[PDB]
Design a protein around this ligand. Structure first.
Ligand SMILES: *[C@@H]1O[C@H](CO)[C@@H](O)[C@H](O)[C@H]1NC(C)=O
Ligand SMILES: *[C@@H]1O[C@H](CO)[C@@H](O)[C@H](O)[C@H]1NC(C)=O
Lengths: 269, 269
């Protein structure tokens, strides 16, 4: 169980995350209304939500996503898309750690996620700063599914401490580095990280703890099944760095579970 | 607002239809438990249901499907897979009629559907007749979604009146031939056709009336949205050959509404 208000937020950013895949913004001019194909993001459509900036295959890591202004909910949202071919991305995923002392001390992060962020960091930092100046009253939220969740998470840890809170909602995000990072993300100030997982979704189980990785705490574990609707009553907050008994069980994992976070995500009907 | 019992039947056969895509059918041993990936068919898994016979790319139209035995619900089910790539299949759909007096005099059917069925009929009847003999008390049901729905309806009309009722539950089915064929599907005894539709699904609107097609009556039209769970109250029975105000309405159609009959269908997570 989690609060209704938290549940509403989890649903909304799952949709903002779903929109990184299913919205029609390839080269949508800034100012367009955010809309999605196949009932992907109805809450988002319902808000006065427009694009601030849309990016695609950006930088070294082919980072894709968008920055949005939502006047209804008073948000600045930076949404990272995950892989366009998830199963592949999963089997092609290396486990290499890299030092990331310039974000936290003795921190080691995943090499590909930290790099891809690093390469787009300055352009996007700038773009959040602008929006924040233009709407000082709005909450800044970073969000993402899968790879997008990892990115989001790395970018929040990176850009916090600069005079505006950054909240992060990740959905099915992989592990992003070492126990020291997990600790940094557990305790850091200047915002909250909400790490959402589903059932036996495989992706938050990777890269393995046996490659030196750990999970930040806490974890919001969706227990309800794939293609089942989520209620506030189906989400358990799991406390403890690499707590087990949430998604971190030694049972057998699943890919489909990864594509159902409140609604269909990481794929478009 | 259809009955609870009818709703349960609707949901079950949607899943048997979904199972045609997401099962691990291929050709797996006869007498194997039927299971699907991605929670595509939990009600079927819950049944004591097994394959009797699976076909892949059989005959003229590469017909794909399975025949199943369901000892829990007392059914013999012939379920036909739709296309592997529905968007391409719709773009390539041919509108030609070919005569089918041997089904019903005056009748013209879609040429590709009728020819694909014609080409596997003998084998499939023999398989069905065999199962009827072994379980003479079980209800025979043909089912399918999309092109599968077409094949189930045709096989139906062709194979009824040989001593055993055949019910047909079809999900987002295209039209299957001329007004004469439509009429005949509307009246024929020894089994009931339940032709189910969703919102603005594109496939029940093809081929168009203009090319000389009609829809049998009645029509069960799910009005709840894509990715929204269906209740009894979201289904409306619609009377009259070529009646308008269920799926057959003058608005823009949608491919995603085609992929959501009670649950995900025509695609596999
Ligand atoms: C965009 O959204 C606003 C407010 O949410 C709306 O009133 C406006 O008409 C929309 N534009 C289009 C093209 O629909
Ligand atoms: C198939 O499911 C039935 C119950 O519906 C069960 O008794 C049987 O053992 C299962 N078979 C396998 C191989 O899992």
């Amino acid at each position: 169980e989690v609060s209704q208000d938290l549940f509403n937020q989890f649903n909304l950013f799952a949709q903002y995350s779903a929109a990184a895949y299913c919205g029609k913004n390839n080269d949508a001019p800034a100012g367009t209304n955010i809309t999605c194909t196949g009932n992907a993001c109805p809450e988002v459509e319902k808000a006065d939500a427009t694009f601030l900036y849309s990016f695609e295959d950006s930088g070294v890591g082919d980072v894709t996503g968008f920055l949005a202004l939502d006047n209804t909910n008073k948000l600045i949202v930076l949404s990272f898309r995950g892989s366009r071919s998830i199963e592949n991305w999963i089997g092609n995923l290396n486990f290499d750690l890299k030092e990331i002392n310039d974000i936290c001390s003795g921190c080691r992060g995943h090499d590909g996620f930290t790099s891809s962020w690093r390469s787009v960091a300055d352009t996007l930092r700038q773009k959040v700063e602008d929006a924040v100046r233009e709407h000082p009253d709005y909450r800044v939220v970073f969000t993402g599914h899968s790879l997008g969740g990892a990115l989001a998470t790395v970018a929040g840890a990176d850009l916090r401490g600069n005079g505006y809170d950054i909240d992060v909602f990740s959905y099915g995000a992989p592990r992003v580095g070492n126990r020291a990072f997990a600790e940094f993300l557990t305790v850091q100030t200047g915002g909250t990280l909400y790490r959402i997982t589903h059932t036996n979704d495989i992706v938050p189980r990777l890269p393995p703890r046996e490659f030196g990785y750990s999970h930040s705490s806490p974890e919001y574990w969706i227990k309800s099944g794939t293609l089942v609707p989520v209620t506030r009553n189906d989400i358990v907050k799991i406390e403890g760095i690499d707590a087990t008994g949430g998604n971190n069980q030694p049972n057998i994992p699943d890919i489909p579970a990864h594509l159902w976070y409140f609604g269909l995500i990481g794929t478009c009907l």
